[PDB]
Amino acid sequence: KSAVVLCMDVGLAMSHSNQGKESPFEQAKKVMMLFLQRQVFAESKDEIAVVLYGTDTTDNALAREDQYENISVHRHLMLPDFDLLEQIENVVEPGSVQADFLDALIVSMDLLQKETLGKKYTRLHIAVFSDLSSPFSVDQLEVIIANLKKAEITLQFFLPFSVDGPGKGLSDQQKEGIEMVRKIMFSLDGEEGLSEVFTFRDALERLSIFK
Amino acid sequence: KGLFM
């Protein structure tokens, strides 16, 4: 069995819809739902946790004073189930704030470290869903990268654009986020790491097996 | 890999 954290940006900017089209939030939710549906249908043994960042509430083991705010553990590590599908589909909504992505990653790693203690997992994995529109502190990257490698946690990113034609009007913050994603994934697995960054559209096409 | 595992 594996352990997977779905680390989903639900911050305010995720709710923006281009001309009524689907917002990044709805696109990310659809990818998460297709993944969870396949896991449940197959009776997979993998355990799935869900961390949301950008929530109006704060609920996580690291939260103190003004640290790790607006990050919430929606589902601790366990088998996915029909309750989770209903919650992701019909309960989870966008927040009205932004949270720091790297703090959400730290919360996700800490959750995996704590909740896999004394258990046997083949792999530990974190999947990030975001549009990279909000700021983060680049200095804490060194510790995060080191801890990911020590813990043998692998990463995937799911975005509304490629990390490599017509430009998409990306903000300077989104471009900085792109550089951060490339830095993390390259440190973790070189050039192959960069191929673990996907668009929502590509992921939906791969995962849309129920029709 | 990952979610496509």
Domains and CATH numbers, chain A: 2-207 (3.40.50.410)
* Alpha carbon distances (Å) from A139 to A34, A155, A181, A205: 35, 19, 14, 36
First to last CA, chain B: 4
d(CA A86, CA A24): 19
The minimum CA-CA distance between A64 and chain B, rounded to whole Å, is 31
Inter-chain residue contact A156 with B2, CB threshold 8 Å: yes
Pairwise CA distance, residues A59 & A72, whole Å: 4
Distance CA A41, CA B2 (A): 17
A chain contacts of residue B1, beta-carbon cutoff 8 Å: 154, 156, 196
Length of chain B: 5
Q: State which residue of chain B sits closest to A31, comparing Cα positions.
A: B3
Task: For residue A87, give the 3-state DSSP assignment.
Answer: helix
Residue that is written with structure tokens 């909504």 in the block: A93
Resolution for the entry shown, Å: 1.9
Distance CA A179, CA A172 (A): 11
Long-range contacts of A79-87, Cβ-Cβ distance < 8 Å, separation of 24 or more: A79/A45, A79/A46, A79/A47, A79/A48, A80/A36, A80/A39, A80/A40, A80/A48, A81/A40, A82/A40, A84/A36, A84/A48, A84/A50, A85/A33, A85/A36, A85/A37, A85/A40
Helices (H), A43-169: 82-90, 101-115, 141-151
With CB atoms and an 8 Å threshold, state whether B3 touches A196.
Answer: no
- Residue B1 and residue A196: Cβ atoms within 8 Å? yes
Query: CB A186: neighbour CB atoms within 10 A?
Result: 13
**Gap between the Cα atoms of A203 and A30, Å rounded:** 10
**Mode of pairing for the β-strands spanning A71-78 and A124-129:** unpaired
d(CA A165, CA A157) in angstroms, rounded, equals: 22
Is-contact A71 A56, C-beta < 8 A? no
